[PDB]
Symmetry: D2
Subunit: 365 residues, 4 copies
């Protein structure tokens, strides 16, 4: 049978350990996939530290992958109806939803499925066939996985990264009920989520894209990938930033704001930048935090504002994200600062934790 | 023509009776005899000097129905009917500039920064003076959006509906799906929330639940269509959440209307809202202390929409009259007092004390 | 157990009564005792071999309500409730693949090319055989979308609603605004149009006008909420257009539903539609000769939306059940005949001749 | 003492436009006197010249596509962003003024459908002072109700003038689509200015694939140059070949979104067969009553669950968004301007547009 290896999380806050798995057969309808690129996410650090309550042990982490089909045990179609075969290059939606609940079937919001099963997050490696995350030479995909064939003209590293931060960013923009033509977009934060938001905002036809953050290196990147204006929170005052946005928008404020900071306190700045009638997509905050002092009359009622929380993404967002991403490979590849062998998965988590890396991608040896 | 009005000359001092002689009216204007004038809870705040838009002196009253006396030129209503002396009409209290970003580009006229409103930011010092409904007569500018009504319409109900009803309608109109199969929770049982009951019912909501503190208002909400009322003073937060969870199979409410006037209503409402739900916030009407808002739990993880609602526009006005017109007998139950115009000071006192739910004034 | 069903062996051959011995059912499947089975006009086309989807032999019947006999394993309804013996249920006739572009990307499961439908494209020759509602029992796959109902629900009405009702609902669901203040014109007064009357009313339409040729169906349309009916034998096309222009102040209808089954309906409907109006075309159910379409006048100059409507999905299912549940007394009037299952041929005959509006079959 | 202006006046249908001079002193309260710098010649100007548009009074100064420079404002005028206009400002404006009082303007919020819509160079004659109500002129007088946008010396006024008509109608067509264009396949029928602006708008909104079907190789080459992924020449392929091409690109589904930009009702016969189940078809090119086409209701509407949406002109929201898209694509869109003529050659301009020797002509005073 097949000799696979992976980096396994056995106990929280303890280094991932190398382990080998002999793969004999795979479940009916499943797809055995050779991982070619595996994204390391900020959230993987959180999971490693034992702060994500969905996470069983032991587990093969890694929810962002691109790979080559080794074997389908039976037949599997991709989302366009193409039958997969050995050697096909694919990406896939990390989440499988039930297809039977209120959100999957009635409201058509499958990202809200309470039964959502996610590779490298709530799928452990204890029970055979074990290989349920991307920090591995190989992953076994269930037959219910949403898959998309890609080609050798696709940058698999970029696609892997895009699966997570990109598709969330896409969801955030997709909730806006108008075209972006003529619109001013403000993005708070310049990690992968905010930076995909720059390229997504550009690609959907936004007039002006402004990014507010605190790292000059990340802000330079934002400019190289399409931002019209960047504002460094450490070099400018709140009022200076408000005036720059008010100047650009003829005194109205921004039409659409993306929170991509991870910090609930971002809404305090963002609310004062939003025009009357504007739309604030809140997608960065990823853990419970202290409550923020929210001014209901000023920020919601008087402003006639929409505040929209964004929870992950579904298959519609996945395919649309691949499509935008595929027009933007050269720019988006600039987000990958580090490329490491799988056996260095621990160092990769350190790099991400310390912010030495913007994004790290692992490759099996 | 000799008109009279009850005029606000000094905040916190009683409205005073005053006579006005109306000869010429401005070009294009419509002189209207007031038949019904609603006394709104916001008029109390204006009376008390709490509204910074309010010039003095001013004839208050932004909620009106009346009879056309004359048109200086020609005026069509929204359906294109030329107005003539004798016609009965209602009208939108607000006039927008029709030239700014919100009027012409984003098509959100309610957000017009140049919005002019009878009985609110239009004083009575300058001729022709009559720019509010606490008067025998009002002069409507040509730009006013008007609708003709008939003798089969209830003008008292229509006056009331103009304000609270049209804001309630705006709150429901922002919901991007139909209300079929949906559970609606309304927080509050003043005019705003009670209109919400009738609008929710009228748009097809499956369940309409009202949370408030007054048994008399809760009985009324039942009478006009609520499936369930929950008295906030006689139940726990946890009991009310359980009741809503039982009705929605453990999910929560699809749509919540905040109609209390208290920002703290979001603390409870946020925990009733299903994942993916929609919270329209329309009641809070003054700057208040900030509330501790749980961004992850209430917005992000919930994938929720919080939508603030500012007043209403002409599309909301027309839709509100249409709903109201199919519900006159239910909605007339909100009017607890009808007083002559000269007793306007008592009307304000009734509304302030909540001895009244809604007061209508009539001239003479 | 020994079930019985009425089987279609050859097109145009009378349905044959047959017994089926059921020993065990596939894993996760649900064995359901049929309590009400609706006979649809589309069953007549199937019976004659006009529907190219139809395998033979087949147990027809795609409108069903029933009582759970057994689940081989466990099955949750759409609200997550575990089904158990004795539960009353309704279900979506169609099961979609959950994997294709329509199911997963555009979220239009009604357009699934792999859609499997009880009594339509599921034959009865392979065990467990019972894949249609003209039967004492049906075996539902684990993938079926089910909803529990109660003894307070009218199951005869629910069976009917599953088809025509959910298609009507889809047609209204596509309209991008509220129905408040709107005038709705419905063409045709069979079950689709009649459900259209009730739905239009329930979503808050101001005026509902029905145009058809059957006096008795038009009387029923008034009994269930139409404001005006217009009979094509008794009125001219010009008289109809004037009546609709009078109600809409010269503009035309805001929303039209085609529910006649005839392509030529568009000729009249296009001239009743306001500029900017919305025309949902849901009745035409077979390929027909092309109609002469005036692209400039009816689409471009009118800035009109013509929207075709193909069946329905689980979202429309639940929402239809929800509106129907509030209108059982009105909608019961559509059921003109109830016949034992063994009389299924006569039921198809009644539906073909239009002596019935809707027939319900009951086992035993 | 007054301002000396001149224009090319249509006095009688099918007779040459005639040069005439005017002296402009007073203008109506609130009005803006504008020096024309660019005037687009539209294909519909030909039909109006010929006496085919029932809206057209005589005499009239044609030209509904314009950009220019503020000479004077009688009072005050703010552009749509709130900026006060002053003499010397460069502007563009919406050709159409709506009443702001009717059902469509106030209730349904569809001002393009206002029955009282007043359009420079179309239904506004030139015989009553101050006369200058069209762009085939040295100057135009804009009413206070006109929606205006200030532009800069870095904007291409020739491209903006053209964009005002064909471009805003194409924008309207795309704006009616209820989803994002991400991952979508767009087919455009026709490669005149309307269809060609469609290409740039489709690209700008993020469409994945943009395909153009037309009959002219030159125009199909232009469509490729401004961002089309594929062109199909309908004179050199069968309907079946074109459908196969679209089916191959869309994994056998059909187009997500089609724009009819041909002017021929018969285009729907092919487009309907290219549309996927659940697809959206904006019909914007057909501009005059035509014979009815044989429409297959079951196959093209019902079974397809298709949306067919007719597109009538545009409003100020479309205007502003068109100017924004256009402003990022000046160099591509300038490729559409094939001829620039002096105002006094307006008759030759119409000839060029009618013969189709020109794709788009711009007129310039002086
Ligand atoms: Zn689910
Ligand atoms: Zn991730
Ligand atoms: Zn009020
Ligand atoms: Zn304004
Ligand atoms: Zn049926
Ligand atoms: Zn499918
Ligand atoms: Zn033009
Ligand atoms: Zn108008």
């Amino acid at each position: 049978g097949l000799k696979a290896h992976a980096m396994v999380l056995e106990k929280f806050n303890q280094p991932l350990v190398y382990k080998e798995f002999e793969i004999s057969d795979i479940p009916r309808g499943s797809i055995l996939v050779e991982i070619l690129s595996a994204g390391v996410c900020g959230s993987d650090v959180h999971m490693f530290r034992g702060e994500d309550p969905r996470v069983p042990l032991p587990i093969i982490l890694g929810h962002e992958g691109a790979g080559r089909v080794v074997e389908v045990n039976g037949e599997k179609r991709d989302l366009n109806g193409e039958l997969l075969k050995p050697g096909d290059l694919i990406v896939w939606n990390r989440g499988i939803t039930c297809g039977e609940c209120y959100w999957c079937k009635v409201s058509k919001e499958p990202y809200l499925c309470p039964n959502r099963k996610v590779y490298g997050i709530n799928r452990g490696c204890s029970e055979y066939p074990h290989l349920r995350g991307c920090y591995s030479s190989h992953i076994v995909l269930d037959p219910e996985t949403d898959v998309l064939k890609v080609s050798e003209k696709d940058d698999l590293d970029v696609l892997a990264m895009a699966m997570c931060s990109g598709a969330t960013a896409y969801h955030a923009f997709d909730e806006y009920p108008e075209s972006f033509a003529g619109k001013t977009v403000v993005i708070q934060g310049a990690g992968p989520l905010g930076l995909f938001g720059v390229v997504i905002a550009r690609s959907l036809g936004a007039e002006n894209v402004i990014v507010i953050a605190g790292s000059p290196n990340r802000l330079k990147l934002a400019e190289e990938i399409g931002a019209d204006l960047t504002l460094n929170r450490r070099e400018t005052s709140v009022e200076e930033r408000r005036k720059a946005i008010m100047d650009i928008t003829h005194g109205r404020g921004a039409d659409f704001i993306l929170e991509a900071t991870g910090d609930s306190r971002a809404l305090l700045e963002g609310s004062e930048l939003l025009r009357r009638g504007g739309f604030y997509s809140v997608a960065g905050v990823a853990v419970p935090q202290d409550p923020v002092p929210f001014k209901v009359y000023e920020w919601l009622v008087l402003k006639n504002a929409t505040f929209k929380g964004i929870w992950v993404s579904d298959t519609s967002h996945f395919v649309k994200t691949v499509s935008i991403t595929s027009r933007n490979y050269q720019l988006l590849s600039k987000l990958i600062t580090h490329r490491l062998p799988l056996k260095e998965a621990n160092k990769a988590l350190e790099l991400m934790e310390s912010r030495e890396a913007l994004k790290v991608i692992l490759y099996p040896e």
